[PDB]
Design a protein around this ligand. Sequence first.
Ligand SMILES: CC(C)(COP(=O)(O)OP(=O)(O)OC[C@H]1O[C@@H](n2cnc3c(N)ncnc32)[C@H](O)[C@@H]1OP(=O)(O)O)[C@@H](O)C(=O)NCCC(=O)NCCS
Ligand code: NA
Lengths: 197, 5
Amino acid sequence: MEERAAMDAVCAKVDAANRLGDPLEAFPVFKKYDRNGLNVSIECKRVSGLEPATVDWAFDLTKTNMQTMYEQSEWGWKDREKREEMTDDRAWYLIAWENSSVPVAFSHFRFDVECGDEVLYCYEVQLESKVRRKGLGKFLIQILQLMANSTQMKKVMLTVFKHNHGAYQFFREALQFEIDDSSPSCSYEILSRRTKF
Amino acid sequence: SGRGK
Ligand SMILES: CC(C)(COP(=O)(O)OP(=O)(O)OC[C@H]1O[C@@H](n2cnc3c(N)ncnc32)[C@H](O)[C@@H]1OP(=O)(O)O)[C@@H](O)C(=O)NCCC(=O)NCCS
Ligand code: NA
């Protein structure tokens, strides 16, 4: 593959993915999660497609769960800058609804170029305490993984705090993410899970 | 959480 053509395909695949109407539409059986006393519907929307209240809920949950860990990192917690990130037009959301009125979990992800590669970047995966350790998180990240296979991303990547020990074990051990080559190995690591094509 | 370098 010639370089200019290789760079073009990379951009083409990332742009095609971001033009999708509903990326979860390729396997709608994953729009339901009903296991372990959990019964949830899952939708995939651009951030533009979410109610302001839902966006606030996501930001709030993330802050409630992550603020201390952000202060314990080099980053610190920056409210406005985290809000910007999560409301960037390029932001995609996977959201879990307990009833047609109650959001209990979400992921913020994007289709992007990272270190020259087409990747699905998982910015956030955040659950209410009450729906944790029931397989919902694992279910959500598999959805990201299937989407990466379907859209021809090379991997699903994310950043995890070294001091977020539980999340680290979730990704690294339960989900078998590797330490990505772009990892500083800093108070964080970059994790990835390659697609198989 | 977030995107580090
Ligand atoms: C981290 C998180 C996304 C994982 O989702 P989850 O639904 O609760 O986890 P799962 O049920 O899918 O767990 C699958 C396996 O991963 C491991 N695991 C998950 N969470 C873990 C934790 N906090 N500590 C240790 N191991 C964990 C377990 O081995 C688990 O299997 P098990 O319950 O049979 O023992 C979720 O718990 C959460 O929202 N935490 C708060 C926010 C956060 O820290 N997000 C970090 C992303 S950077
Ligand atoms: Na997260």
